[PDB]
Amino acid sequence: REHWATRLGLILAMAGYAVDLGNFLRFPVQAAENGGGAFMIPYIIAFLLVGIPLMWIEWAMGRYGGAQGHGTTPAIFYLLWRNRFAKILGVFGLWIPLVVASYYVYIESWTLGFAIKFLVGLVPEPPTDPDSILRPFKEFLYSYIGVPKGDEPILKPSLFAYIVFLITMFINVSILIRGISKGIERFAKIAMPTLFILAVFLVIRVFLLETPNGTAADGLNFLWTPDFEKLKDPGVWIAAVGQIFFSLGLGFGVLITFASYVRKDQDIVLSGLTAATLNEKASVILGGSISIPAAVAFFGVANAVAIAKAGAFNLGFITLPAIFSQTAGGTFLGFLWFFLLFFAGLTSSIAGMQGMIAFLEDELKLSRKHAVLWTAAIVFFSAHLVMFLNKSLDEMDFWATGIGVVFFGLTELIIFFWIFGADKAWEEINRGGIIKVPRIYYYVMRYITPAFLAVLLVVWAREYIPKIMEETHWTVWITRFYIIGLFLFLTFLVFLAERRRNHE
Numbered sequence: 001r002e003h004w005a006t007r008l009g010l011i012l013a014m015a016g017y018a019v020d021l022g023n024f025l026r027f028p029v030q031a032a033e034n035g036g037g038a039f040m041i042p043y044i045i046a047f048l049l050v051g052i053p054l055m056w057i058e059w060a061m062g063r064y065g066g067a068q069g070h071g072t073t074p075a076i077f078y079l080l081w082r083n084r085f086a087k088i089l090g091v092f093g094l095w096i097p098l099v100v101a102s103y104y105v106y107i108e109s110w111t112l113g114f115a116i117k118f119l120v121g122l123v124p125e126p127p128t129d130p131d132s133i134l135r136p137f138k139e140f141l142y143s144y145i146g147v148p149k150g151d152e153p154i155l156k157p158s159l160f161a162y163i164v165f166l167i168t169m170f171i172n173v174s175i176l177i178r179g180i181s182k183g184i185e186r187f188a189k190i191a192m193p194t195l196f197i198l199a200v201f202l203v204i205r206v207f208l209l210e211t212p213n214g215t216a217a218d219g220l221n222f223l224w225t226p227d228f229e230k231l232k233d234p235g236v237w238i239a240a241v242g243q244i245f246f247s248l249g250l251g252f253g254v255l256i257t258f259a260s261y262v263r264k265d266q267d268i269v270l271s272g273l274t275a276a277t278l279n280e281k282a283s284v285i286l287g288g289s290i291s292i293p294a295a296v297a298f299f300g301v302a303n304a305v306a307i308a309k310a311g312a313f314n315l316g317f318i319t320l321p322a323i324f325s326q327t328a329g330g331t332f333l334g335f336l337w338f339f340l341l342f343f344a345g346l347t348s349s350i351a352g353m354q355g356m357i358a359f360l361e362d363e364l365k366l367s368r369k370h371a372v373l374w375t376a377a378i379v380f381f382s383a384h385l386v387m388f389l390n391k392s393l394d395e396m397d398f399w400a401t402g403i404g405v406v407f408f409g410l411t412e413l414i415i416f417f418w419i420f421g422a423d424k425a426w427e428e429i430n431r432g433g434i435i436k437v438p439r440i441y442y443y444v445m446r447y448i449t450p451a452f453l454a455v456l457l458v459v460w461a462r463e464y465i466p467k468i469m470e471e472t473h474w475t476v477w478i479t480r481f482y483i484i485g486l487f488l489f490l491t492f493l494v495f496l497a498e499r500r501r502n503h504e
């Protein structure tokens, strides 16, 4: 089996995964909408009671199975719980990231496209007035995505977008085909620094942004000024518990699969705690000092509310480009911004797509090459649904993430800590650890953590399930029909896996 070459490269791959566009975009938005500085209170809390424990747990389940030559949750869940239902419940941890990758790699391509489009100077140039600057970059984005001009639920992306996508894929395979050490880790050693460099440089430039409407200081102020009145709202406490899940990226089986390339007795307690610290430092410091300040700097603090309600997506592909088109030589900032996001995704997309490669390697005994190419073929195929069918993207994200984090996460907990046994698990977590997990985390892992996930499951099931189930168009069934067909397919490979093992 393959293994990590360096302790650093491990943390950098892990942090490479965890570090998102979400750090630079989703995280700052969630803050401003839910108390600003006050959002840190429920955020830090859920970071200790939920994010930190589960992190160790996925890491633990990973190494526990990874020693036994099994990186995927179909196998691992069978080892923690030797049941027929455990393999099935484990299929999700192979189904969840595959579905997400069916659109993430595509979204990742946009950045590369936009980066190229911004580098060569092929960008809209306005014209004064806010809508008279945003609309050119609002339409620029729609041409790339291929947003429908008719009632039809049919996207028609530009030929260039498609080409960049293939290129983007080709980039992913290029790193993936070189294994864990000479590929992901080797790249994580290059990407993570390159990422930090761009972040700071942007942050610096952003702080030097002065417009008639305001300054960057006004953005940091608005963002970090704590409105505690919103902490009374349960919705803030929920949006917090989820945001951490999203930022750390738990409940996708990726941490598990990654931690399955960790040797049997190498530390996972501190290693994970470090990668987790890197991601969150990146969010609050870097990410929360580029977008929101630059937005507030240009559109005043008056629109700082309206900007936040405009969704993170707009801020990154419409608002921030349109802002850069006005600054001194900002066509290069556009290139720097997008290329920053490109890597942020590229360090993650290679990570998530490894879970499938590992499955074919471990269970179906495929070479790394074949496991890589076939996985690329599956993701490339599915992506056409997201590329061409409208709102297919959102449907995939809704199910794979919305459910996949809340359901599979609480599944990882009960299987490893309640079924496999708390004590046997607690030792499996602390084992090899340079430091030891505090004794109090035993109660958090066993009672407090699943208490939160449980409350989270209930609130989610009431609010989000009746919405997508009726009010939506009929083409959502096509997306549903497809993603269901994937789970049924992975059920068949899991079946083929166990039938190949009884023979030998």
Ligand SMILES: CN(C)CCCN1c2ccccc2CCc2ccc(Cl)cc21
Binding pocket: 017, 018, 019, 020, 021, 022, 096, 097, 098, 100, 101, 104, 105, 246, 247, 248, 249, 252, 254, 344, 345, 348, 349, 350, 351, 352, 353, 401
């Ligand atoms: C930067 N990260 C948060 C790591 C996850 C990125 N990501 C993702 C992003 C948004 C929502 C769900 C998921 C699911 C995990 C997963 C799995 C494979 C890939 Cl190719 C990306 C991917």
Ligand code: NA
Binding pocket: 018, 019, 020, 022, 023, 246, 247, 248, 249, 279
């Ligand atoms: Na993150």
Ligand code: NA
Binding pocket: 015, 016, 017, 018, 019, 020, 343, 344, 345, 346, 347, 348, 349
């Ligand atoms: Na990343």
